[PDB]
Design a protein around this ligand. Structure first.
Ligand SMILES: COc1ccc2c(nc(NC(=O)c3cccnc3)[n+]3cc[nH]c23)c1OC
Length: 842
């Protein structure tokens, strides 16, 4: 058809990659997966409720934390309804449904409709108590009043989805040879090929070639015989082919394909080059740069596939192995114990990761028995979702389809609320699937299509990776295409505007980093063309309005060209401010966006999301630490959108206003600065308060993730007392608790204080609360390192967090350890901060 072509061309542009193009393939797994995804997509599209889909109530089943109940001192919540220029305030109880509210307002004044929040595409509707809406919980936490407009439900027809048209030999590979157009480097060290049979980052078996000269063309013409039988290869096994002299080049080929056939025949595989363990090392994708890249050539000639009583001290040993954290290596002795007593091990949902990584995947009969084992899934199926546990089964240690589906099965009882929390890490976990079609991919697809807020973020998380990693762009592009094919015409339109806006702003942030070298002075000569360039696009190019990618409820309109600037940084970010598109917005404030180029913007995403998780983990134990994890979305290569928090300034800038000299710091400017911004001694008091919580929150959070040692430049504070770290994109100090912080805390040097006793109190409460979730945190950390960073040590980088969380200690030792950290920051005072300036001559 012809309109099926126009729309494909559309999808391509939304995606930033062409899923039909086939220059860089060697089997049809990608196409097959496009076909396979049609079914679950269509099922979820037919299944979802029109009305609730269009309105996407954002809701939770969690209780209201004690610290938000305190703010309804009366069992009544105030809601303010609007006509056009008229308004009225209604008393309501926290167990009231928005249904029970519209009628008690219609009975109120009486001389069909829905309540949507003023200034936003957000809605209070569906059978949920209003205490349970996220907007309502945000308004309470922030002391703001609930503003809502009476209007019509959005026509569900706007989400119209378009109709779619659619034996016993040992294993052996021959290494023919290697080639690369341009070699010239060091000189001539030897070079060899190493072949691994791999399953779940476990090497089943390994053969090398002879060493030989590193010329632009090397040849071996050898059969490498492996020790494994063909019949013993498990589904998901990779042939991992590596070049040394030392690891220089890698590529992978799936030994068994998406059709359960053994891979046979000739290959010429274009390899990836090491930079100078991580998720990139595992990809089945070949390098698409056919011209510059090293290739290897190989031939595959080789086809069907498809209890009693435990003694006492053994149980103790078993149970002691199970109580161990996810990063304690299992001894051979440990593995046999788990395996031989597998059935006793199946009663402990917690044993599952260690049990399934006690399996000899390279023996067919053992795999069989493992599959018979997972048929008895009573205990697993009946245990409560432990997200931590489930993530472990989706990391690089598990390549078995059946082990990974019981993890995914567990994810099914996450409510949208929790999915949104884990959504980025689940997307990144797609990098550990052996095949493009997975239970995990389909979970994401389904949940994305069932809820617009999940859909939206799923679009950007996938597009973020599609634009910046060649290693996985093909896989993620197929998943996104599948998504965009069922999300609906209103969302496609919405997406199209967002992509147009960031693309236009790219041709801008583009030509501007250029105009002043690295000299930090920003000429008005340079803000000349910025303003000119913005005016340009405003007429007949730049969309009327766009959904703010990191805050999808909010609609940005026209630039406020006057307030736009180029920021002072060595990078040259755009400081952009937009008008709100929504005439019902209560405020007149601008939407400020930093548009930033030339940095790993994905690590900032990873870190910020872990922060949000940490807040929720704190929520489950009734704590509020007033983090401010600002919005931040990667749109493409080295480059994206970042939310500007209002009335906020850098600590550094605060230190450079009164005086600003060369490495000099003052203890009282911050405190004084808070007073000058506080119009009442009251509001001043509320500030010192927020500072104590926010300061402690960042100290703990940041200690734990090992990102605590920051320069002043990258710590901010709001006029209203909220501290917050920025720019996580990659003597020492565990965190930033400097004398200027301590002076706000009404303390100095040796002595104590009321606010400082509190600050220590809150740190300890918060720390030991994360230690209750030790395992979840280690798995997120570990996963972040593998799918997020440069190079990292499978036992060194990752183990930082175990020591940071002080694994294996009683609550008392741990409190001590953390309180010692506070003392370390005290001793060093201004030292490290000063060092930065010192070194700018080293
Ligand atoms: C007045 O200058 C700023 C005001 C608010 C800012 C702000 N910067 C923010 N973030 C950043 O500048 C930033 C840079 C690179 C990577 N991530 C975050 N940031 C995140 C939330 N709010 C803000 C301001 O510039 C220093």
């Amino acid at each position: 058809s012809e309109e099926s072509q126009a729309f494909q061309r559309q999808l391509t542009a939304l995606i930033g990659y062409d899923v039909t193009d086939v220059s860089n393939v060697h089997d049809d797994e990608l196409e097959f997966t496009r076909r396979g995804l049609v079914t679950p997509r269509m099922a979820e599209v037919a299944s979802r409720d029109p009305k609730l889909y269009a309105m996407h109530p954002w809701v939770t089943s969690k209780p209201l934390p004690e610290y938000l109940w305190k703010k309804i001192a009366n069992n009544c919540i105030f809601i303010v309804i609007h006509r056009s220029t008229t308004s009225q305030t209604i008393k309501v109880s926290p167990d009231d449904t928005p249904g029970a509210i519209l009628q008690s307002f219609f009975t109120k004044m009486a001389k069909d409709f829905v309540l949507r929040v003023c200034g936003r595409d957000e809605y209070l509707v569906g059978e949920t108590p209003i205490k349970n809406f996220q907007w309502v919980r945000h308004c309470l936490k922030n002391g703001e009043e609930i503003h809502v407009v009476l209007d019509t439900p959005p026509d569900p027809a706007l989400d119209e989805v378009r109709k779619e048209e659619w034996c016993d030999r040992k294993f052996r590979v021959k290494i023919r040879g290697i080639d690369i157009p341009v070699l010239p480097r060091n000189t001539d060290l030897t070079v060899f090929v190493e072949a691994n049979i791999q399953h779940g980052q476990q090497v089943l078996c390994q053969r090398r070639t002879s060493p030989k000269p590193f010329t632009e063309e090397v040849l071996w013409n050898v059969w490498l015989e492996f020790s494994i039988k063909i019949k013993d290869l498990p589904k998901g096994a990779l042939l991992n082919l590596q070049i040394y002299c030392r690891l220089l080049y890698y590529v992978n080929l799936l030994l068994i394909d998406h059709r359960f056939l053994l891979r046979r025949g000739e290959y010429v595989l274009h390899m990836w080059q090491i930079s100078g363990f991580n998720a990139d090392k595992l990809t089945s994708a070949t390098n698409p740069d056919k011209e510059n890249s090293m290739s290897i050539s190989i031939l595959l000639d080789n086809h069907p596939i498809a209890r009693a009583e435990m003694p006492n001290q053994l149980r103790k040993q078993l149970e002691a192995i199970i109580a161990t954290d996810p990063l304690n290596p299992l001894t051979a002795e440990d593995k046999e114990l788990l395996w031989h007593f597998r059935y006793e091990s199946l009663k402990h949902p917690k044993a599952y990761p260690k049990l399934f990584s006690s399996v000899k995947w390279g023996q067919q009969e053992i795999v069989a028995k493992t599959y018979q084992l997972l048929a008895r899934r009573e205990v697993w199926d009946q245990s409560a979702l432990d997200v931590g546990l489930t993530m472990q089964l989706l990391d690089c240690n598990f390549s078995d389809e059946n082990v990974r589906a019981i993890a995914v099965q567990k994810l099914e009882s996450l409510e949208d609320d929790d999915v949104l929390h884990y959504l980025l890490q689940l997307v990144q976990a797609v990098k550990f699937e052996p095949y493009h079609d997975s239970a995990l991919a389909r979970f994401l697809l389904k949940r994305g299509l069932r809820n617009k807020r999940i859909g939206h973020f799923l679009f950007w998380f996938l597009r973020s990776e599609i634009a910046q990693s060649r290693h996985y762009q093909q896989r993620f592009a197929v998943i996104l295409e599948a998504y965009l094919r069922g999300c609906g015409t209103a969302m496609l339109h919405d997406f199209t505007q967002q992509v147009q806006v960031i693309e236009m702003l790219q041709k801008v942030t583009l030509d501007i980093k250029s105009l002043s070298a690295e000299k930090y002075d920003v000429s008005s000569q340079v803000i000349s063309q910025l303003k000119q360039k913005l005016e340009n696009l405003q007429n007949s190019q730049l969309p009327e309005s766009f959904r703010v990618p990191y805050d999808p409820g909010l609609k940005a309109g026209a630039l406020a060209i006057e307030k736009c600037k180029v920021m002072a940084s060595k990078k040259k970010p755009l400081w952009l401010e937009f008008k709100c598109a929504d005439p019902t917005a209560l405020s007149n404030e601008t939407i400020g966006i930093i548009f930033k180029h030339g940095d790993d913007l994905r690590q900032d995403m990873l870190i910020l999301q872990i922060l949000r998780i940490m807040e929720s983990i704190w929520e489950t134990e009734s704590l509020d630490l007033c983090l401010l994890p600002y919005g931040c979305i990667s749109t493409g290569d080295k480059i994206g959108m970042i939310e500007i928090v209002k009335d906020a300034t850098t600590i550094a800038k605060i230190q450079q206003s009164t005086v600003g000299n060369t490495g000099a710091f003052k203890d009282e400017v911050l405190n004084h600065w808070l007073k000058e911004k506080s119009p009442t001694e009251e509001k001043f008091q509320a500030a010192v308060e927020r500072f104590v919580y926010s300061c402690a929150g960042y100290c703990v959070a940041t200690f734990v993730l090992g990102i605590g040692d920051r320069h002043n430049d990258n710590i901010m504070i709001t006029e209203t007392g909220n501290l917050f770290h920025i720019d996580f994109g990659h003597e020492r100090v565990p965190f930033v608790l400097t004398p200027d912080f301590l002076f706000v805390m009404g303390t100095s040097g040796k002595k104590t204080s009321p606010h400082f006793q509190k600050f220590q109190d809150i740190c300890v409460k918060a720390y030991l609360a994360l230690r209750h979730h030790t395992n979840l945190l280690i798995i997120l950390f570990s996963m972040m390192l593998m799918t997020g960073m440069p190079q990292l040590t499978s036992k060194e980088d990752i183990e930082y967090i175990r020591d940071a969380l002080t694994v294996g200690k009683n609550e008392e030792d741990a409190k001590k350890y953390f309180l010692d950290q506070i003392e370390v920051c005290r001793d060093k005072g201004w030292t490290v901060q000063f060092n930065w300036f010192l070194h700018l001559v080293l």
